[PDB]
Amino acid sequence: EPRLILDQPAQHTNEKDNINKRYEIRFGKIYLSRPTMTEADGTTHAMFPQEARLRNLTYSSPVYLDMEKSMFTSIDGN
Amino acid sequence: MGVPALFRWLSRKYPKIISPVIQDEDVDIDGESRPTRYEDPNPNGELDNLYLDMNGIVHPCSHPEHKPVPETEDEMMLDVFAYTENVIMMARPRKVIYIAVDGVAPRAKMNQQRSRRFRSADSNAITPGTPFMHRLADSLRYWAAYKLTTDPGWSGIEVIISDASVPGQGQHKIMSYVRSLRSSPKHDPNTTHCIYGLNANLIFLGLATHEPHFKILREDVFAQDKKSYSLQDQLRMTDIERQELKDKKTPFLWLHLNILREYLQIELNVPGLSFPFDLEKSIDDWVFICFFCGNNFLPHLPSLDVRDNSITTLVTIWKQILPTMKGYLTTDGYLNLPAVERLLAELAKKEDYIFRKRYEDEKRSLENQKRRKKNEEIRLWEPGYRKRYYETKFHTKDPQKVKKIARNMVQKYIEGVSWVLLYYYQGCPSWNWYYPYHYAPFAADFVNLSELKIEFVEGTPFRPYEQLMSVLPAASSHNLPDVFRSLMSDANSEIIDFYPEEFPLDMNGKKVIWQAIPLLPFIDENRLLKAVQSKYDQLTEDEKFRNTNRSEILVLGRSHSHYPTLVKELYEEGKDSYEFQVDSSGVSGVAIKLQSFDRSGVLRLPVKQLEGYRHYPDISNRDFLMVEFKQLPKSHAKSMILSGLIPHLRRLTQEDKDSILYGDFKQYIGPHGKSQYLPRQGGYKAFIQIH
Amino acid sequence: EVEQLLQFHVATYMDNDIAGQPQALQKSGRPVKAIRARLKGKEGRLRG
Amino acid sequence: TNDIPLMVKNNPLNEQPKKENCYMSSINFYGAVVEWLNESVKDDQVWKLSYAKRNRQYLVLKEVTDENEKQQIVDSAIPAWFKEWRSELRNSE
Amino acid sequence: YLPDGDIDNSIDLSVGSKHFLLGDSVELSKLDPILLALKEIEKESGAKTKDRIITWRGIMRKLLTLPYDSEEDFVLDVVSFDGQLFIQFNVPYLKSKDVQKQGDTEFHKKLQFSGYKFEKMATLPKPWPECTRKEIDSRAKSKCNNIEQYGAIVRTGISRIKILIGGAVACTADYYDENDPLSRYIELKTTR
Amino acid sequence: PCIEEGFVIQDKEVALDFIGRRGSAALGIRREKRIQYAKDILQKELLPHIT
């Protein structure tokens, strides 16, 4: 499901003005990083399974998704 | 005249409306065979309102298979009493027992029952205005008072008596009362009703009420193994066989009209409609079609035949033609001229095919009876049948006269059908109109319907003695008053021509004299009324009282809740009139204090008591009350379901629905569920129920 | 009105689930454990 | 109306969405608001109750001191004819 | 009045939205009807009532649903007179609300007109026996407005406080009961 | 026996009406969109893996 579209065809409190204003969210590349743990202070550092076992953390990796916000006007995010 | 084939048609088309009526045998509790107390729960579903048609009970010739033969009217009265206790025991109502007796109905129904009484002709003693009905009214009054005073379970029962003096057709009084209750905004829409009647037409009458919680009690016609053997040899059998007319509990049947309503919802939903399909309006149109196919008011159409499934033919015709309509054929008592015009035009196109098919069917039937065991010669299959028919019936060779007479036939027939529809949906619209011809026209004659005009004259109900002499033939002058006898049978009377001893018989191509055409001259009202009013002054005081119409009577129990209020108003504050609206009993109308009623008097049985018939003791008037009753004013009542109407549980399960399209059980009576609507699609209740 | 106040106090003390009127709620928001519920339900003593 | 509080709690899809009944709490909040309105406002005082959805923490009640705006609010609420009607009622009293 | 079978017609709730009427918010927010009724009952009785709070149904619904319906903003004005409190909307904030309102899309206007059209179709101007067929089938072409409305002035009690509320009644069940008028009242709503 | 019992249904439209009649859901949808609902039921959720 790569796209999510919200559309306003015309007559959006307009005096019979037609403009297809669409905002689209497009899903792109998925980025996976090495397992990193963020301290309660705010600092982040690389985590290893021994530290997760001792500190009762969860060995996990953050995942980044590229959603791009495309603006469409033609009458017819990192 | 009425056809049980209509009941046969319903059985063979919609068999699920039939129930065999659990016979109320004495309840065996802990070894005690308790006689069924009226307060005991009904094993056949509780009933709120019970309207009785006395024409179906006190009318011996309707059941001549046995031998009632009461030499004295006392035996008649006591047997009628026993039959009434039997029917109310097996029905067991809870709110209202409307005892309705035939009166004076409008002029067209007068013509119908005039034909009925002429062909029928003590069996003939059952007719309003006669002393037999005069004693019947008093006997029913005393029986109602006795039952109200004696039975502990009749505290909440109110009996409304419309004696023979009160004008109106039997079931027409029930219809007027139902409409009067409907006109009150405080009416309960879920009040279940039931009418004890023998005529099949009552079915459509229920559909006229637009009250789904309605049922009809009838005799089990399909199950009589009648015997007429010796009276003593029935002692052989005790369980399997008894005297089916005197010693065996006669089985009954119940026609539930809500199941029929669900049916007619199913098969009348034709596809591809320019306008939304309404089940109410479609049901009204179906009742209209049933009336068009034949009724006690209008004559027999020469193309539609009940046992030839002409009802199915017209249903199919409506199925083809409804997509092309923009609206229904009729709406809430009034006709839509273009739609009925188009449907009659389609039937006119099918007329030649139908006539030819009838011709081959007649020839094949005659061939079948060949191996199995006023000159006619009309030759309906041959062309020019209409002209020959008009020449034979009217003896007029003028084509212009025939065309004008046919146009008048069309206008009068439209007026009469609208009259009947308004009569069954809005009360009586006219007491004087009658159909002025002996026959029905062809559908091909129904053209330019919008040009025709509709009018009516309300008038007044006819005098009971005038009506009696208009309905009593020369062979039953005993009931007719001796003063008017010279006006009926004497050859020197000015109106002797109205009653010929011999009249022409028109077979009209029928098979049995039961459905023949009794060709008789139409009654001229003017000279007849003048003649009867000429000798009206020679009547006695009792005859004049029996010739005077009166108002409704209401009889109420002393232990009833509404009795102290009526006492405190009428007999204490001196108020002459009181208004009901809704009450605890569902009755509504105008109450008048009755001066003839004696508060301290004693009411005595007008029937000489016979031993072994549960002797009736005299009961003083102190133990009940009686008032003069009126209804709410007449109003234009729509044909649509009321708000708050709770439907019942659907009897059909996906089998009859498929079969109709593609060629105890007492829980289907009351209002199953509490919501007037049903969950579906994406509602809260629907989504919760589905998953 | 103060008498009705005392009546409502004793009612909430004895009965918790009162129809059409609020129950006595503790400072933590939980309803006050009335003596009627002490013998009814899973928390009741009769079930055990 | 009297069945809706029981209907929502007895739904089969979500038997236990919350251990605290929202309807009785709503009625209690309504009663508390009514009592606070009656107790706080004194005689012949014009006040303003503005609810801000940005806060959603408490209700703020303020007094009106501008005579012109107070009179305009009174005229919007109390028309003149009703004012003289209550004035003659007071004179009778 | 709304039969079950009427649903099967698949009636659209957008017929006539282009000529929808809307009354003035400031005019409808005034407490004129309640004060008129109060003057009438005071003249009839001749003694001052013990009522304390005067309000409308919508204001008190907002005050009741505030904790769990927190997606709308409002400002109200309270005036104390003769020991009685009259509360209503705030005129400048109501004007600001109208300013925000004309920016609403025609979809929201169509939804509001759909609700009002449902109310029009499910009601009758007279009791059912006294209604005619024309008054029934012409509800599809009936103009819809927010100006004309019916209300009930009802005394209610919370703790020690008597509140006189003016509630906009959509319709009644089947008639009007002069003993307990509240028992026959019925309103209508629309939801996705 | 299956051949002889399946005779009241003749063409595709009446078959679609028949299958949509029993397709749970609401009532009163009527043929004009009950046929569409039946076609949707035949297309998706009826052997989705094949096509």
Tab-separated table of C-alpha atoms in Angstrom, chain B residues 269-273 650 654 657-658 661-663 680-681 690, chain F residues 8-9 14 17-18 21-22 24-27 29-32:
chain	number	residue	atom	x	y	z
B	269	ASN	CA	-41.409	-6.368	-5.085
B	270	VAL	CA	-41.106	-6.170	-8.869
B	271	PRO	CA	-37.683	-5.130	-10.221
B	272	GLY	CA	-36.860	-1.973	-12.129
B	273	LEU	CA	-39.299	0.625	-10.793
B	650	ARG	CA	-40.748	-14.057	10.525
B	654	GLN	CA	-35.448	-18.882	2.948
B	657	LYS	CA	-39.157	-17.039	-0.431
B	658	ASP	CA	-37.220	-18.993	-3.056
B	661	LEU	CA	-40.043	-16.479	-6.935
B	662	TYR	CA	-38.805	-19.624	-8.720
B	663	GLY	CA	-41.446	-22.124	-9.812
B	680	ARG	CA	-29.550	-4.339	9.245
B	681	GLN	CA	-26.460	-3.332	7.259
B	690	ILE	CA	-23.658	-10.154	13.360
F	8	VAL	CA	-34.982	-23.039	-11.513
F	9	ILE	CA	-31.778	-21.034	-12.043
F	14	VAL	CA	-30.750	-15.077	-11.703
F	17	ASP	CA	-29.590	-12.866	-7.424
F	18	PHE	CA	-29.951	-16.305	-5.817
F	21	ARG	CA	-30.193	-13.495	-1.469
F	22	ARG	CA	-28.407	-15.725	1.063
F	24	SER	CA	-26.137	-12.501	4.918
F	25	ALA	CA	-25.794	-8.654	5.079
F	26	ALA	CA	-28.995	-6.579	5.274
F	27	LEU	CA	-32.359	-6.896	3.518
F	29	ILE	CA	-30.845	-4.320	-1.183
F	30	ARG	CA	-32.889	-5.629	-4.163
F	31	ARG	CA	-31.474	-6.993	-7.417
F	32	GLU	CA	-29.874	-3.850	-8.867
